[PDB]
């Protein structure tokens, strides 16, 4: 029922009980659950809701989580039944639990853990203790096409059956339509087909409490289970992956976006894992190692997804991989998987346990529901503000700096309606002066300055005018590494311009000042990921609540405002606040570029010279 004010009148279906202060939870029948962080029972309720509910908003006081069938299946995979969860909700719900919510839980829980998929001898078997449901599944024509049949066309016959590998993904979508999700249970200790690997954990490795908690959530009943884990950048995600690989100790495959990530993973395994270097191989197009004896492999999506003809050695590597049975596979930046080519890689590789690690999951193409069956439910996602309080991560100080557009630029901004309009507001002379002032301020403050600019031309123009290193499309790898190492150590270099390549193509040296000038157009996940990757915990400023500094230069009254607001949606959902600043104190005293009008007019000439073709 809907009130005239737009609020849904839930008073009738939520009978309140007098245990107000003791019970901290509100259970709306829409599926949303509200928790008060100031309650003395916050920690227990937080831990309980993490397993059972998907977080939505985590601000300072009132947190909102959501209930999904995927969340319920994940909780079941943890090992929690319906009765205990319902009792705990009742002991914490301020009002009566709606029956429809209760009915929804009843419907989901019963159907969980019914259908199991097992990979043995390069054959996928669907089994269940209830052949009635199994026989029912035989009715589906899509299942009939997916179910492996004889070479004569005849379908094959605790009863199970082999399934076509190339038809697995379409079957997975059908399981949701059949309301019988697959059970990704792995014989963590009962495996005998795949021999172990002499890889252990070096004593220098330390698992933070949230890291160990997430690992224990993943390893239900001591058995590895495929899933998705969300860790903020700089929280030792690579350490967590190495730890999980050492724990499973079976055949381990890792996938990264670029060869730089591959090298980072190899260094991490050398830093923490006890596996011999000879058993570590990278399937890279430049550094090639034989797949033989490669206990743990690190590769990239493009190498495996190279649909065009590859090198003959690559053919041998692919054949060895297909022959090899993978107990464990590791995927990074899971938000990239929903692409068709990278999705095909999952079909290509035969792996038992597939774990995905990433910092964000808000795909602007909303291709995440199907991702729940590509890998599994989201196992864990840490509270960023909580890690800020715990000191694990730097407490970011975020600002939105409004730079008014020059009227001549603004008149031309209105004049252009096409994609060329981007260059108009991305090249604001007032924005340039503000950036110059901020750079001077932070250099006098002796801070590492990272200037993010998606537009190549704008980035090069800014860097050349300010006489600073710039990173762009080609970015020859030797020069890139040279500039990075100069930035890390040379005190003369503390201002680096990085184009869109800085998101995932390479590791970003730790900095404290991150200035964003150019936007993708609303990539709320990409820019947030890049921000989290840029800024990490810094010693010395641990006590202060603002040890990391981020500033977004936004052109006022432009379409950049809407993009910035849409982009910061996720970060606000993460509890991060953005203060709006218009007037920058100290700019008038300092002398900056484009002080005279014709200088800005000359810049306008230069930008307009770059027409729509550029």
């Amino acid at each position: 029922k809907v009130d005239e004010y737009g609020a849904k009148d839930y008073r009738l279906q939520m009978p309140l009980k007098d245990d107000h202060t003791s019970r901290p939870l509100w259970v709306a029948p829409d599926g949303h659950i509200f928790l008060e962080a100031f309650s003395p029972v916050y920690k227990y309720a937080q831990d309980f809701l993490v397993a059972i509910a998907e977080p939505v908003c985590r601000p300072t006081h009132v947190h909102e989580y959501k209930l999904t069938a995927y969340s319920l299946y994940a909780a079941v995979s943890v090992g929690l039944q319906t009765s205990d969860i319902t009792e705990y909700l009742r002991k914490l719900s301020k009002t009566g639990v709606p029956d429809g919510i209760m009915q929804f839980i009843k419907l989901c829980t019963v159907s969980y853990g019914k259908v199991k998929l097992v990979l043995k001898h390069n054959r996928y078997f669907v089994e269940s203790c209830h052949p009635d449901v199994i026989q029912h599944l035989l009715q589906d024509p899509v299942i009939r096409e997916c179910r492996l049949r004889n070479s004569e066309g005849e379908a094959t016959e605790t009863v199970s059956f082999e399934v076509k590998q190339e038809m697995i993904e379409e079957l997975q979508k059908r399981c949701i339509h059949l309301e019988y999700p697959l059970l990704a249970e792995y014989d963590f200790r009962n495996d005998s087909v795949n021999p172990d690997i002499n890889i252990d954990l070096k004593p220098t490795a330390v698992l933070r409490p949230y890291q160990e908690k997430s690992l224990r959530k993943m390893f239900g009943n001591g058995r590895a289970r495929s899933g998705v884990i969300v860790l903020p950048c700089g929280a030792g995600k690579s350490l967590v992956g190495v730890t999980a690989a050492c724990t499973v100790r079976k055949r381990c495959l890792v996938l990264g976006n670029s060869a730089v990530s591959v090298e980072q993973w190899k260094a991490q395994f050398k830093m923490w894992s006890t596996i011999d270097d000879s058993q570590i191989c990278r399937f890279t197009s430049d550094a090639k190692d034989k797949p033989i004896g490669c206990s743990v492999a690190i590769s990239t999506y493009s190498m495996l997804g190279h649909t065009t003809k590859r090198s003959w050695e690559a053919e041998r590597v692919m054949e060895w991989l297909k022959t090899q049975e993978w107990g464990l596979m590791i995927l990074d930046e899971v938000h990239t998987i929903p692409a068709k080519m990278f999705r095909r890689v999952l079909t290509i590789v035969q792996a038992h346990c597939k774990l995905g690690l990433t910092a964000t999951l808000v795909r602007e193409d909303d291709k995440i529901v199907d991702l729940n069956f590509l890998i599994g439910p989201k196992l864990y996602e840490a509270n960023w503000m909580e890690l800020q309080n715990n000191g694990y991560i730097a407490k970011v100080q975020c600002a939105e700096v409004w730079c008014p557009m020059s009227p001549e630029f603004y008149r031309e901004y209105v004049a252009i309606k096409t994609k060329k309009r981007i260059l108009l507001y991305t090249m604001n002379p007032n924005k340039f002066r503000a950036c110059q002032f901020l750079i001077k301020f932070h250099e006098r403050r002796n801070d590492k300055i990272i200037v993010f600019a998606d537009n190549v031309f704008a980035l090069k123009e800014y860097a050349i005018r300010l006489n600073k290193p710039y990173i762009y499309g080609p970015t020859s790898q030797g020069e890139r590494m040279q500039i990075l190492q100069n930035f890390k150590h040379n005190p003369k270099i503390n201002t680096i311009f990085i184009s869109k390549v800085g998101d995932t193509s390479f590791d970003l040296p730790e900095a404290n000042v991150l200035i964003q000038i150019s936007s993708h157009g609303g990539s709320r996940r990409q820019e947030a990921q890049r921000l989290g990757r840029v800024l990490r915990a810094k010693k010395g400023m641990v006590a202060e609540e603002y040890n990391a500094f981020f500033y977004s230069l936004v052109s006022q009254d432009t379409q950049e405002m809407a993009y910035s607001t849409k982009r910061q949606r996720f970060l606000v959902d993460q509890g991060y606040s953005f203060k709006v600043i218009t007037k920058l104190a100290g700019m008038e005293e300092e002398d900056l570029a484009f002080s005279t009008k014709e200088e800005q007019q000359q810049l306008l000439q230069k930008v307009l010279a770059a027409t729509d073709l550029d």
Partner: peptide, 15 residues
């Protein structure tokens, strides 16, 4: 080797 199992259900109890 603590990864075998982990539950906090009893911590969620009436007091």
């Amino acid at each position: 080797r603590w990864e075998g199992g982990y539950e906090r259900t009893w911590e969620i109890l009436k007091e």
